[PDB]
Ligand binder design. Sequence first.
Ligand code: CLA
Ligand code: CLA
Ligand code: CLA
Ligand SMILES: C=Cc1c(C)c2cc3nc(c4c5[nH]c(cc6nc(cc1[nH]2)C(C)=C6CC)c(C)c5C(=O)[C@@H]4C(=O)OC)[C@@H](CCC(=O)OC/C=C(\C)CCC[C@H](C)CCC[C@H](C)CCCC(C)C)[C@@H]3C
Ligand SMILES: CC(C)=CCC/C(C)=C/CC/C(C)=C/CC/C(C)=C/CC/C(C)=C/CC/C(C)=C/CC/C(C)=C/CC/C(C)=C/CC/C(C)=C/CC1=CC(=O)C(C)=C(C)C1=O
Ligand SMILES: CC1=C(/C=C/C(C)=C/C=C/C(C)=C/C=C/C=C(C)/C=C/C=C(C)/C=C/C2=C(C)CCCC2(C)C)C(C)(C)CCC1
Ligand SMILES: CC1=C(/C=C/C(C)=C/C=C/C(C)=C/C=C/C=C(C)/C=C/C=C(C)/C=C/C2=C(C)CCCC2(C)C)C(C)(C)CCC1
Ligand code: OEX
Ligand SMILES: [Cl-]
Ligand SMILES: [Cl-]
Lengths: 32, 29, 66, 55, 36, 35, 32, 75, 348, 30, 63, 480, 31, 23
Amino acid sequence: VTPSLKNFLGSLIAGATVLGGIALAITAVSKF
Amino acid sequence: VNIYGLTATALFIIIPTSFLLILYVKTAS
Amino acid sequence: PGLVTPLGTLLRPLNSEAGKVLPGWGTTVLMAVFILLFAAFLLIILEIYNSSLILDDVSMSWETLA
Amino acid sequence: LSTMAFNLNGFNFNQSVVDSQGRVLNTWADIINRANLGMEVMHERNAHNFPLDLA
Amino acid sequence: TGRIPLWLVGTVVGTLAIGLLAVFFYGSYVGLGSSL
Amino acid sequence: PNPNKQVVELNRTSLYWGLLLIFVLAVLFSSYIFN
Amino acid sequence: NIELALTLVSLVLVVSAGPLVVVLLSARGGNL
Amino acid sequence: RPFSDILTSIRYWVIHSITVPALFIAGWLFVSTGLAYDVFGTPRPNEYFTEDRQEAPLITDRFNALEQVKKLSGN
Amino acid sequence: IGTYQEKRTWFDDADDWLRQDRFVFVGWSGLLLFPCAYFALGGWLTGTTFVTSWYTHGLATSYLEGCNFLTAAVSTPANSMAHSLLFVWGPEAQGDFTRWCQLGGLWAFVALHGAFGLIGFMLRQFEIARSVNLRPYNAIAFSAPIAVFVSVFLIYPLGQSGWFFAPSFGVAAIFRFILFFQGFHNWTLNPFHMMGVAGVLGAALLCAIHGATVENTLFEDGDGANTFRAFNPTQAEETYSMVTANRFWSQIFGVAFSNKRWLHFFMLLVPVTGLWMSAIGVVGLALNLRAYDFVSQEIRAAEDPEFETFYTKNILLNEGIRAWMAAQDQPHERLVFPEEVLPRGNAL
Amino acid sequence: MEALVYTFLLVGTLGIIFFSIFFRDPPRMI
Amino acid sequence: AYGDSANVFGKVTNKSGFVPYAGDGFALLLPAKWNPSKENDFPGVILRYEDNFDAVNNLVVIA
Amino acid sequence: GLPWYRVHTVVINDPGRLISVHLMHTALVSGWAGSMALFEISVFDPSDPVLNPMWRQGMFVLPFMTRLGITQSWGGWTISGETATNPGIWSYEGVAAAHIILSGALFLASVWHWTYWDLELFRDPRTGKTALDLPKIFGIHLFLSGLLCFGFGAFHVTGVFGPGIWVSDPYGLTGRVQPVAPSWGADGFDPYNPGGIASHHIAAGILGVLAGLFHLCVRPSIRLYFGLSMGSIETVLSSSIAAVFWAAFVVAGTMWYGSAATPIELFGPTRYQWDQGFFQQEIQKRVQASLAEGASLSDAWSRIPEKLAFYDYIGNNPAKGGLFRTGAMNSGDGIAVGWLGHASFKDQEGRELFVRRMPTFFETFPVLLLDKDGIVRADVPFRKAESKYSIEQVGVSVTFYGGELDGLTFTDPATVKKYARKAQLGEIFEFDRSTLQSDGVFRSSPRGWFTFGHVCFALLFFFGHIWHGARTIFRDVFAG
Amino acid sequence: IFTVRWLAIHGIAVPTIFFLGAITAMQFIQR
Amino acid sequence: VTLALDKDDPAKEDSVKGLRKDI
Ligand code: CLA
Ligand code: CLA
Ligand code: CLA
Ligand SMILES: C=Cc1c(C)c2cc3nc(c4c5[nH]c(cc6nc(cc1[nH]2)C(C)=C6CC)c(C)c5C(=O)[C@@H]4C(=O)OC)[C@@H](CCC(=O)OC/C=C(\C)CCC[C@H](C)CCC[C@H](C)CCCC(C)C)[C@@H]3C
Ligand SMILES: CC(C)=CCC/C(C)=C/CC/C(C)=C/CC/C(C)=C/CC/C(C)=C/CC/C(C)=C/CC/C(C)=C/CC/C(C)=C/CC/C(C)=C/CC1=CC(=O)C(C)=C(C)C1=O
Ligand SMILES: CC1=C(/C=C/C(C)=C/C=C/C(C)=C/C=C/C=C(C)/C=C/C=C(C)/C=C/C2=C(C)CCCC2(C)C)C(C)(C)CCC1
Ligand SMILES: CC1=C(/C=C/C(C)=C/C=C/C(C)=C/C=C/C=C(C)/C=C/C=C(C)/C=C/C2=C(C)CCCC2(C)C)C(C)(C)CCC1
Ligand code: OEX
Ligand SMILES: [Cl-]
Ligand SMILES: [Cl-]
């Protein structure tokens, strides 16, 4: 795996976590 | 600048003008 | 209506059903997965062209024609 | 425009940033000055017999 | 609320804000970015 | 017999605006057209 | 810097004079 | 509570009578300590020109930039 | 619900919460507008406060360096980066914040986040308008600002060598960008910019004339000097006389609006039209397709030395701007022009 | 004759403005 | 990341307006604002400096 | 009375006449396709395929026809420059005539669909009112679209049945339409990898077919249908406008940045090529090789192909053009006649001097001669009162190796300065600016013009998406 | 105590107060 | 003589050869 590809895949995971966190946040606030 | 240049300007100042005049005359009629 | 042409009758069933919807989000969740996957694909091709995602295989140059 | 007509030009921060030893650290203002110089040396190519354009 | 004249609060805070901007102009003619 | 049949409507101001625009645009691009 | 220091002292006293008059007048229900 | 009501609540003032001062002090210390120069790699007034390079640095290698910029910065 | 009654879903929950009366309308668009805008504007502040372009443009662009509000600016990345998105994890910064800032990564960060912020803002306009059940003319009008940003901060930079030749986020930076266009692209001569200037000047005239007319044709609905007091927020009758206004402009200017709707529609059409026209012109400059000069006069001036016009004079000025700024404005070109080669007029 | 073309365009624009002020639709509407 | 404290309320490094320079068997105080130049106007040019703005103001040391 | 900007809204609820109005647009497009092609063929010179390529002749549609295979012509000439032994029905003229005949057929079809707009097919069976199942209409159209995409990539491009696609060497010195093989690999995503076209079209095609079946079989979600107004024709229009404007940007970038789909010997060289000295480095490279072999400077420069040298010219740069500089590239610089040969500028000291090439961003660039070190050693001074790098005082002589001026040496200050000004514009070629009476200004290549036009359309269509999309979302408010 | 309104107020005010302190120190740095 | 780079650079300072491997 090219270092660029490895970093790119990692950034994708980071983006998913950032998005997932937003969903969790709105889920919790909507829940309460 | 050539015949084409003047022809372009002529058409641009004639085709649209005539079209507008026709519509107004039709509506005025 | 009217003008019932044979071609019209042949294609009639294609447009016969309409407004028919599936209750609930249906396949919306599956669609969302595809949208995300295709979005990732576009990012890869863009980064490769932008040279951000450097890959050993691709050469990203007119020399690729060679 | 009227004030500048009386030679009251806008802010001049040319060579305002200086390092420890005194070397001038150029800024965006300096780049704008570089262009201003070009327009100045060109305007009235034959209408200046002296360096200063006091007029 | 109470025991606090908001008009004074504004006058004081406003005076402090003027002072902060004055420090910026002071720094304009002193230290870095002073052309000297 | 299409019920969708309608008619275009051009008023005096609309006509004036159109003619003014077509002329102003010509005055603006005429110089560039003749380069 | 003594001159600068006492200069600032003067600025403080003079600038505070105007509000001082208002505050006092307001406190004693003056005609402000 | 209207902002005016809060801007009149002396309690609110007491609550920010320490936090706000600390926030400003921290900002002053940040720059005074020199942490800002290290955090953002902003050249200090005495390190803009190195003994090696007496001219503005020009990064020319895109994929070899990391090492280039570090060398230009004289590490 | 849904003209059929459906079971409530988590979406319905999140929907009501996001679309809920709140100090500020979060909505669904806010999930993009609030975060991106904060990072964009925040990055611009951090950059202008403590970030240097000494390694990107060799220029001091930070308050820490001693720059003021006007000089401080987030400069574009070096031309070596070309059209690289320059992520912090990118093949350049390689996850180094200090270097990412030194490489000019913040500029791309602010631009990218700001670009999506504008998209989120326009989406917010549609969202709020749909909730208020009103035609989203405001959102359609916000297309002109977005078009200008995309054409000047994206299309042009992409059409040129790299992000280096893009507007840097700074007062002085924008000024040098403007001067560069005149010297190299002759933006002023471009007909599309001309139409754009007409729109901005025309919109300003409309805004001023409309405010003056209305505020000067107001009816006496009060018994005090202050007319502003004499108005009811839920009044039905117009506060000013459209008739009186119509006659005044009909006699003073010769023509006057008679439909309030058309007047306001014209007030929003003029500015939007102008911005879009200038955007098309910037698209041409991106590809270097510019109306730099008229060959007809150029040939005449060359053959006839005496022949001269303000057009020829402006051409010479552009020649000086390019020759007396290229050395620094474009450091990648590494152009060392002997003073004798530079074009200088008599004296000066 | 490019100047003649330019003069025609300028004259034509002015003519439109003329009728737009004196031969305009009566402003029956406020 | 050398932890050099900012020169807050400190003293100016150099206000002489001249930076001492040393070359091959020749030494002189170059003007501080003047920047290094890379144009060999004449043969034997050893040191070449020019003003930040006007290039007319230049200095050449030929050996 | 519909306003002028709302006259074509009459067919919004007339599916029968909607096909007619669409048939008209298709006919007009087909007619222009064959018409413009016929005009270009009537104004095209295939005599010189080296110094007078199609892009230099300002041809626009001819490149596209050649890209997919059309190369011969009933004129007995090939785009390659050789005689068209058997152009066949698919000659440039043939394909043009075909499009024109298609246009006519579409016109007659439009007339019938307009007259007989009331077809029961449009009516819905449950109510009898005219209703279109947009959900299924997209599915059936998508399925057919996928079929063509896969077929084009697996046959026309692959070559198994289709003629093939135009493929050229990295320096476009030699290329033609040859069958390609799908890469089916990471390299397949390289924009300059021709094989990618076949692989992508085959992959995208098969998926499209499958996706079409899904839309045909699976019905839309109730929440999605209402949420996306899947019952509104304007809904598909707004989304479709979004797709076309998106593609336009992608197509433009592909043309500007260059790709295997945009041959440099069919659309002209890219501006970046000059910016990076692509062709220039090759010329110097092979020259150095020939010198390393032991050949004289004349021999090496003589080896350089004029076509390669022609590519190394600021004039061929697409960015070097004007918005209103209309005409073919040949006009404005003349019709290339031949190559004068490499110009070698040397000072009296014997030091080789290199003329700094003009950067694309610069309309006029000062002439500067620098040594290998990169130090300016000579130039044409604007002020000659007391020059220190004057070509005269530096004593610079230009010697041309290869080309017309092969072995020709020039010491005349004026002559040397003249060649120096040309050198800064790249390789020095002879141009006939009499036949076309060139104005002496550079023009943009069809590549640049295509990019400008499609980018402009794309930016405008963005407003179209927002407008039609806003109307669909606020249909209730816009209702009236 | 941490409503959206409160979060927004401290989302800008807290950073601004720090930035202001930093800018003030910068006004007293000597080259 | 001069290296291809020693020739491409003076002719075009932004040439890939001169703008690459510079580190
Ligand atoms: C296939 C794309 C498409 C289609 C089918 C439509 C269809 C429609 N649009 Mg529309 N529009 C589009 C794209 C499209 N638009 C784009 C990209 C934009 C952004 C600029 C707009 C912006 C727009 C606005 C602002 C409006 C419409 C409106 C309308 C409706 C009225 C049409 C009309 O006024 O009669 C046409 C009568 C005319 C006199 C116009 C013809 C004059 C043109 C300029 C001359 C022809 C030039 C050339 C041949 C155009 C083709 C160029 C092409 C080859 C690249 C209609 C149903 C109107 C509406 O109310 O929406 C419902 C409306 O006001 N559109
Ligand atoms: C995106 C579509 C597109 C593109 C990229 C091109 C590109 C090109 N065409 Mg072309 N053309 C097109 C569509 C297109 N065309 C269509 C639809 C037609 C049918 C009418 C033609 C008919 C055509 C002919 C007959 C010729 C070309 C030619 C050319 C080439 C010369 C450059 C040029 O066109 O002059 C420069 C382009 C401009 C200066 C644009 C004009 C500026 C705009 C219009 C603003 C004007 C606004 C103003 C209101 C206009 C009226 C003002 C008034 C005073 C008149 C060039 C590569 C020439 C050629 O090379 O021959 C093979 C040629 O002779 N084209
Ligand atoms: C093994 C199978 C295979 C292979 C080898 C390839 C190979 C390739 N595909 Mg591909 N693809 C496949 C399967 C495959 N594909 C499948 C199954 C699908 C789904 C059907 C796709 C869908 C797909 C799409 C949609 C695209 C490709 C593209 C490409 C090419 C990449 C170059 C490129 O990105 O264009 C150039 C660079 C870009 C497209 C990146 C830019 C994208 C931006 C976001 C577009 C701009 C939009 C925006 C409105 C612009 C705003 C203004 C701007 C100034 C900012 C490449 C040769 C691209 C292509 O067609 O090349 C033209 C592309 O667009 N493929
Ligand atoms: C300098 C000129 C100019 C500016 C600064 C400007 C600014 C603004 N216009 C807005 C709106 C509008 N403008 C409109 C028409 C126009 N706007 C015009 C000209 C301008 N408009 C013109 C000429 C017109 C007439 C055609 C309309 C119709 C609207 C609106 O509806 C909207 C509004 O409601 O205004 C009150 C606001 C939307 C902000 C936003 O997206 O929120 C979120 C913030 C975001 C997305 C951050 C953007 C970040 C930017 C793009 C990049 C980074 C910039 C740095 C932080 C700072 C750089 C500083 C240097 C440039 C000096 C904003 C205050
Ligand atoms: C020999 C000769 C003739 C020499 C002259 C040569 C010469 C100088 C040539 C130049 C010609 C020329 C004009 C060139 C410019 C070309 C150009 C830049 C064209 C741009 C075209 C274009 C479409 C631009 C896009 C942007 C755009 C749409 C701008 C529109 C600008 C515009 C028209 C704005 C309004 C201007 C204006 C004067 C408004 C008056 C409004 C008005 C009547 C108010 C009255 C009024 C107001 C109220 O508030 C109320 C309440 C009422 C009741 C009311 O009534
Ligand atoms: C980039 C980035 C990021 C973000 C960041 C941010 C967001 C930041 C922020 C920052 C900030 C948030 C800052 C602030 C600023 C502000 C300031 C600095 C202020 C200013 C003011 C002044 C200077 C004033 C003046 C004057 C006047 C005029 C008024 C009153 C007062 C006075 C008088 C003084 C993240 C995380 C995503 C990661 C990645 C990267
Ligand atoms: C009837 C018939 C026939 C015939 C047909 C034909 C003849 C066709 C063709 C037709 C045609 C012949 C078509 C075409 C048309 C044209 C077009 C379609 C174009 C247009 C143009 C445009 C649209 C453009 C515009 C513009 C300008 C100019 C400026 C710039 C920009 C632009 C470019 C955009 C036949 C035999 C078949 C048989 C059957 C019947
Ligand atoms: O005339 Mn107009 O202008 Ca104001 O400066 Mn002095 O004098 Mn001229 O010079 Mn530069
Ligand atoms: Cl002048
Ligand atoms: Cl004088």
